[PDB]
Design goal:
The structure is a homodimer. With 174 residues, chain A is an all-alpha fold. Chain A has helices at residues 10-25, 28-41, 46-53, 57-65, 72-94, 106-118, 124-141, 159-173. The longest helix of chain A is centred in the middle third of the chain and has 23 residues, at 72-94. The chains hardly touch. The structure holds a DNA duplex (21 and 21 nucleotides). The PDB classes it as dna binding protein.
Chain lengths: 174, 164
DNA sequence: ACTGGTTACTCTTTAACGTAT
DNA sequence: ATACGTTAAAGAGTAACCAGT
C-alpha cells in the first residue's frame, strides 16, 4: 500500500540519529525541560517512556522535574525515544481525518471548572457540548486541527469522562 | 492480655466506631506521624487498600464500619506494643523534630565530620524521644526509626545534592 | 443519574546505595 | 573524601467503576 510506504528512509533515519547526537551535546537540563514540555503537551505518560526504553521511573521523573543527572547512554535512549515518538504522533494525526490511561489536559480542565461554577450536575446536552469544546482545545494546544481529534487516542474526551470529572469534583467539595 | 484488658480494647473500638470518623482519622493519622509508623505497616496487617487508607486518613474519604473496625483494632493493639517496646522490615523515617536540628546544623556546615555527626545522632534521638513522650534513655524503642551515624551522613549527602 | 464506597494506575518523594573522580 | 549516578520503597493524586437506589 502507498500509505504504508511511509517507513523511514536511510537518510531520514541518519538525521534522527544525528539529532540524538546533537541533543547529547546540549545541556541536559535544557533538553529535559523540552522533553517534559512535550510529554505535557500531548499528555504522554512517563510509564510509556519507562516500558519502551527501560529507564527507571524515579530516575526519569527526577531527571525531568529536578535535573537529576543521567548518564549519556541512558539519556541517549530517552532522546532516541523522543525523536521516534514525535514522528509517530505526527503520522497519527494526519491519518486520523499496555493501553495508556486518559489524562485530563490543562486546557480542558479550565473549560470544565468554568462550567462547574455555573452548574455542578450538567445535563447530557451540556456534557456533550463540553466534549466538543474540550477536544477542540486539546487539538489546539498540540498545533493540530480539531477535525483530527481522533488522533488524541487515549486522551480523547468522551461524554462519560466529563460526567466522571464533575461527579468526582462534587465528591471533593465533600 | 488480661480479660479486663482484653475487654477494654474491644470497648474503645466500640466508642471509636460510634464517633465522627474524621475525628478518629485525624487521631489515628496523628499517632502514625508521632511514631513514624508507615502506612504500609497498616495495609499489610489490616488488608485495607493503600489509596483508600491514605485518602481516609488525609481527606475523610468514606470507609465502611467493618473496614474502620479493622483500622481501629490495629490502632489500639499497636499502642500497647509501642508502649511495651519503649518500656523494655520497616524503613527508617526522618522525624520533623530531627530535621530542624539537621537544617540548622547544615546551615553552619555542609560536610559534617564524624564527630559532629555523632553529636547530632544524640540530639535527634533525644528530640525524637521527646516527641513521643518517652525518656531519652529508652531510645532503643525507636526501632526502625533509630537515628544512626550513616543516616545523618546520607541526609547531609542527599541534601547537598538537592542544592544542585 | 446519583451518592456512597472503592481501587488500579500513575507519579513524586524519600532514604539508601554504588561509582568515579 | 565527596560529587556523581541510581533505585526500591512509600505514599499521595487521578480516573474510573460498582451497588442500590
Amino acid at each position: 500500500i502507498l500509505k504504508e510506504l511511509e517507513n523511514l528512509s536511510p537518510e531520514e533515519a541518519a538525521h534522527q540519529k544525528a539529532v540524538v547526537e546533537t541533543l547529547l551535546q546540549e545541556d541536559p537540563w535544557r533538553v529535559a525541560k523540552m522533553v517534559k514540555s512535550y510529554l505535557q503537551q500531548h499528555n504522554i505518560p512517563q510509564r510509556e517512556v519507562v516500558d519502551t526504553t527501560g529507564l527507571n521511573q524515579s530516575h526519569l521523573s527526577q531527571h525531568l522535574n529536578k535535573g537529576t543527572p543521567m548518564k549519556t547512554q541512558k539519556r541517549a535512549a530517552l532522546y532516541t525515544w523522543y525523536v521516534r515518538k514525535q514522528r509517530e504522533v505526527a503520522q497519527q494525526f494526519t491519518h486520523a481525518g499496555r493501553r495508556n490511561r486518559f489524562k485530563w489536559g490543562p486546557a480542558s480542565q479550565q473549560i470544565l471548572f468554568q462550567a462547574y461554577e455555573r452548574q455542578k450536575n450538567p445535563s447530557k446536552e451540556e456534557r456533550e457540548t463540553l466534549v466538543e469544546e474540550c477536544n477542540r482545545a486539546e487539538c489546539i494546544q498540540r498545533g493540530v486541527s480539531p477535525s483530527q481529534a481522533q488522533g488524541l487516542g487515549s486522551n480523547l474526551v468522551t461524554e462519560v469522562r466529563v460526567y466522571n470529572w464533575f461527579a468526582n469534583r462534587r465528591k471533593e467539595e465533600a
